Amino acid sequence: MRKFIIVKNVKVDGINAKSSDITVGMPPATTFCGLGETMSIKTGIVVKAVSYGSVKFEVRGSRFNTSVTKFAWQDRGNGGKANNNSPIQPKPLADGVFTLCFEVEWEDCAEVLVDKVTNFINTARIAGGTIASFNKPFVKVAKDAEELASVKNAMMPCYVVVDCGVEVNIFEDAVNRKLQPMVNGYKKLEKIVDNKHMRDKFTPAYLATPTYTMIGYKMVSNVDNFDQALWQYGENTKVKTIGGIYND
């Protein structure tokens, strides 16, 4: 809360939009969680709150059958047939411009952190994307809850993502309320016994499936209280909001 770093107008190219076998479009927040923990392990700072926004997002193609990428032969099972019409493997892409706002606590200096975070961002990936151009990150200061509104007056304009809740199950509710799904986390089902082809020989191997939650894209000014937009790690590998159920 003491120090916030903001980067705006980040141009990302060639985003892999196929997040799952059914979800195509905006990347899930689990990639944001992974990048945040990677930044925590690399720089050495514990991060609690994560925030992001959407500015531009264009999917390559048209109303349906957006984009297909031609994949060539990259396996050692060729030589005779490897001369015409390599397998297709449909996988659409996209393009976007986003922004990030992160919290950091550090009292040794004030600008070395900017140096190292910029250095790391310069050599990163965004869901298979690539950073093209970004503005210089800037620093903001906050103290406690009542003055928090100041930050909403500091980095306009953008969209915000807010939780609204589900009633019984989403299979019909998503269509009925015409909001969009999103993968809040993964639920483990069984343990992978084999430990042969893994990238490590000590990390436990589990199998999991995505779980779907309800989020909505609204205007910042239309948000009555900001704590609905905070994400905190919860029990059973879940992510929750500080404010709970939305109410007027």
Binding site: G61, F64, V68, Q74, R76, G77, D95, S133
Partner: protein, 301 residues
């Protein structure tokens, strides 16, 4: 013992961006404009081999086009590319097998690879059909806050150049373990007045159109994959067939349907196993086996 791993991965060392296309005057380079796309209709007969009967039927079709405005004469193709080091550091799979290849490599000359890559960037091979009919092609490149102006031509008859050597040496040093370097490519061309322009296509399931053009918020643009394929065409390491091709395992381009580097003892995986079991080989092939290693991807199966 020393079983070939079926899973191995390497990072995309070369990262190109989305090439962006503009119309600007030859002598008024301060003011530029974007190029739109638009949509038009065509009506041509059927030219299909072995079908005399269907020559008396019409055909109405709809396609996208792109060209300079009524009064402009310069095409401006600009983008950014990034070179990163960290070579011989696996990102997915392999902790004690990459080093066994490393102790065989590091005897190759990265300077040649950098020279060829920068020569490809400077000459203009990144533009496929835009160079047909242009008398003047030049570029300006700004890296590390220093600028260089190139008027390079003659993609044929490769010759040593000492004016481009410094940037080649810089990036070659970058590859052998460093951070990142970013280059801004700003190709200028004077194709003509009102002539057609060729931006990258993409194919979709049969729709209202039949030739769609890549658009980035009402402006023509080129795919990243095509630029990346332009960067990695250096393979001059076989005894014939000049005008080299792009580098990849089982190297053969489907566009014209040629089959080079077949199962005739010139491949990628056929080399290191016979090198470690037997004598080493010529300096030519280490060049190739590191070239296709620099491009990222997943290898195995």
């Amino acid at each position: 013992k020393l079983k070939a791993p079926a899973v191995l991965a390497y990072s995309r060392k070369i990262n190109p961006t989305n090439a962006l296309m503009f119309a600007v005057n030859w002598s008024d380079r301060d003011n530029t404009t974007a190029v739109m796309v638009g949509t038009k209709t065509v009506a041509g007969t059927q030219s299909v081999r072995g079908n005399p009967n269907d020559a008396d039927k019409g055909n109405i079709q709809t396609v996208n086009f792109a060209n300079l405005p009524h009064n402009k004469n310069t095409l401006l193709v600009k983008y950014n590319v990034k070179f990163v080091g960290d070579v011989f550091k696996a990102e997915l799979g392999g902790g004690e097998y990459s080093n066994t290849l490393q102790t065989a490599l590091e005897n190759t000359d990265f300077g040649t690879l950098a020279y060829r890559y920068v020569y490809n960037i400077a000459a203009g091979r990144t533009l496929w059909r835009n160079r047909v009919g242009a008398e003047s092609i030049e570029t300006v490149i700004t890296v590390n806050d220093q600028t260089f102006t190139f008027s390079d031509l003659l993609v044929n008859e490769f010759d040593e150049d000492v004016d481009v050597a410094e940037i080649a040496d810089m990036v070659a040093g970058v590859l052998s373990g460093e951070g990142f370097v970013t280059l801004k490519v700003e190709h200028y061309m004077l194709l003509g007045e009102g002539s057609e322009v060729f931006p990258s296509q993409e194919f979709v399931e049969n729709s209202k159109l039949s030739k769609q053009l890549f658009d980035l918020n009402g402006q023509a643009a080129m795919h990243d994959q095509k630029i990346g394929n332009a960067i990695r065409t250096i393979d001059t390491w076989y005894e014939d067939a000049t005008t080299p091709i792009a580098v990849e395992p089982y190297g053969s381009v489907v566009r014209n349907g040629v089959a080079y580097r077949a199962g005739n003892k010139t491949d990628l995986f056929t080399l290191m196993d016979g090198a470690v079991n037997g004598k080493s080989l010529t300096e030519e092939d280490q060049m190739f086996v590191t070239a296709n290693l620099i491009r990222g991807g997943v290898f195995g199966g």
